Amino acid sequence: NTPREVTLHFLRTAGHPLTRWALQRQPPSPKQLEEEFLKIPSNFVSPEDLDIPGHASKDRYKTILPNPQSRVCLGRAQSQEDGDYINANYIRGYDGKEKVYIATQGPMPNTVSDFWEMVWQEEVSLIVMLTQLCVHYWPTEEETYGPFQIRIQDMKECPEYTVRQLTIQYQEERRSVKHILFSAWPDHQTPESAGPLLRLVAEVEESPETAAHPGPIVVHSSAGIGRTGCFIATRIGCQQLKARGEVDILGIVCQLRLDRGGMIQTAEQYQFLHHTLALYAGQLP
DSSP states (O other), X not given: OOHHHHHHHHHHHOOOEEEHHHHHHSOOOHHHHHHHHHHSOOOOOOGGGOOOTTGGGGOSSTTOOOOTTTEEEOOOTTOSOOSOEEEEEEEOOGGGOTTSEEEEEOOOTTTHHHHHHHHHXXXXXXXEEEOOOOOOOSOSSEEEETTEEXXXXXXXXXXXXXXXXXXXXXXXXXXXXXXXXXXXXXXTSOOSOHHHXXXXXXXXXXXXXOSSXXXXXXXXXXXXXXXXXHHHHHHHHHHHXXXXXXXXXXXXXXXXXXXXXXXXXXXXHHHHHHHHHHHHHHTOO
């Protein structure tokens, strides 16, 4: 037994299944949830676990690093660019389905081109952005980012988020990307309430998946783990509730940390998950 095998074994086997009923009517107590959250290992990687020269200039935070086993590598198919590094991980969706999301930090001014390279390479058609009133990496009208031309076709303000219809063109090929900006979500905090979050999840679910093999949904926030983690854990929890009438929230969080260290930052965020999914249960047939 080493520290890492202990970590991996916990994340791989821990679980606390909650029926619709137990979720709505008899959840674990706030104290039980705090103690449970604290037992979940972070699965952060040490800087000694990435061998990527000069990656630090492309990280917003020195301690929040992409796990190499699930890291998104930039193959540079479209650029004369240098190495393969972006702080972003592939995230498994419902039932362990691969590459349903890419959790990444919001672009820094020097990684905007890398972010757009990733959107192209991975055939991303949906971006979910979580923020509070981070750069303006999309254009007002039209901008070129490296080899890519991005144009905004439409901008629609909803009560809780702004939906932008964008296009990305490389050479002859121009793709549609839907962009959803959800504000009023501070880092290390929860949304103001669960309703706006559930309506964000519904907005994502109702987005048209035209592709034969759909790309990953890009979810980002400042660090790419707290608000990013809450969002993705909420969607997966809704999916489990709807398909099976139960949710294993502890398992969901553990599975997300296998994909990217530190997903879901606070016990309060973890408690809000339970609260949010208790509400979603009530919408169910």
